[PDB]
Amino acid sequence: GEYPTVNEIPVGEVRLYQIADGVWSHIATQSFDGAVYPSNGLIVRDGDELLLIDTAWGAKNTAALLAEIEKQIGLPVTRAVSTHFHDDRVGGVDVLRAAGVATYASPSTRRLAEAEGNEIPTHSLEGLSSSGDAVRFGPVELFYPGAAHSTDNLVVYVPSANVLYGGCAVHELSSTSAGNVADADLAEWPTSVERIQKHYPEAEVVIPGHGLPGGLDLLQHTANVVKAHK
Numbered sequence: 288g289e290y291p292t293v294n295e296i297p298v299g300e301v302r303l304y305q306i307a308d309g310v311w312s313h314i315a316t317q318s319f320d321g322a323v324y325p326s327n328g329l330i331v332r333d334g335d336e337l338l339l340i341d342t343a344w345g346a347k348n349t350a351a352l353l354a355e356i357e358k359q360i361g362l363p364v365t366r367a368v369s370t371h372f373h374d375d376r377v378g379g380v381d382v383l384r385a386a387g388v389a390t391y392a393s394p395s396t397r398r399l400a401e402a403e404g405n406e407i408p409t410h411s412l413e414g415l416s417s418s419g420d421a422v423r424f425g426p427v428e429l430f431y432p433g434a435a436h437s438t439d440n441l442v443v444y445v446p447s448a449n450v451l452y453g454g455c456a457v458h459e460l461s462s463t464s465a466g467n468v469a470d471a472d473l474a475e476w477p478t479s480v481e482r483i484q485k486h487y488p489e490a491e492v493v494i495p496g497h498g499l500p501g502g503l504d505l506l507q508h509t510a511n512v513v514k515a516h517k
């Protein structure tokens with residue numbers, strides 16, 4: 288019943304966690320440069336179908352994700368959105384595409400994934416190229432807050448449940464640094480978080496890209512750790 292943690296999930300297994308009615312997170316673990324990390328995604332019920340947000344960080348993890356969804360939920364995943372171009376978001380897109388899932392990302396994410404050799408979602412999401420832009424996508428709103436963890440990062444809001452999925456632009460409360468900043472804009476990140484805070488003041492649950500969900504405090508904590516990292 289507790290939120291599944293990095294040392295509790297072997298690499299290759301996936302667990303789901305019920306966030307709200309018709310909203311789950313998915314949690315998996317992966318090795319990278321000789322360390323093991325957890326990572327989150329989202330699942331949102333879309334009538335008798337499911338919308339997936341982000342892969343489970345790798346092909347085998349993402350196959351295991353689809354199997355876990357079939358076991359725990361039993362509705363088909365028909366569409367997926369990747370919230371930026373890194374492997375914890377797009378690694379597994381080829382698995383999804385071979386399982387009948389239509390895969391989407393912004394044009395900026397698709398360009399970055401292609402240039403860096405990561406898997407590439409099929410469909411481009413227009414209407415998200417300027418910070419503050421928002422578009423509807425099934426049961427969610429997609430929001431581009433500006434550059435933060437990456438220049439292309441998107442956040443996702445579930446209006447029926449007031450769930451804010453921050454992706455990797457948002458860190459968990461226990462975080463001590465800004466995570467993997469390889470592609471980050473540390474100077475712009477606080478401004479982008481402020482845009483999230485201003486656009487989603489009624490969020491009740493905030494889910495980071497890695498680690499434990501909480502409330503709105505994750506946003507301020509993120510700004511604090513990024514400012515101090517910088």
Ligand SMILES: C[C@@H](c1cccc2c(-c3ccc(CS(C)(=O)=O)c(F)c3)c(C(=O)O)[nH]c12)N1C[C@@H](CNC(=N)N)OC1=O
Nearest residue numbers: 319324373374375455458462463464465466467469496497
């Ligand atoms: C795939 C992804 C990646 C790989 C490994 C780790 C991360 C973490 C991380 C680390 C640490 C923490 C804990 S904490 C907050 O600092 O206390 C965390 F919570 C998230 C994050 C994140 O922060 O989102 N992402 C990671 N990758 C590749 C990559 C390309 N690297 C290049 N050199 N090109 O960039 C990147 O992010």
Ligand SMILES: [Zn+2]
Nearest residue numbers: 371373436455
């Ligand atoms: Zn990333």
Ligand SMILES: [Zn+2]
Nearest residue numbers: 375455496497
């Ligand atoms: Zn990440």
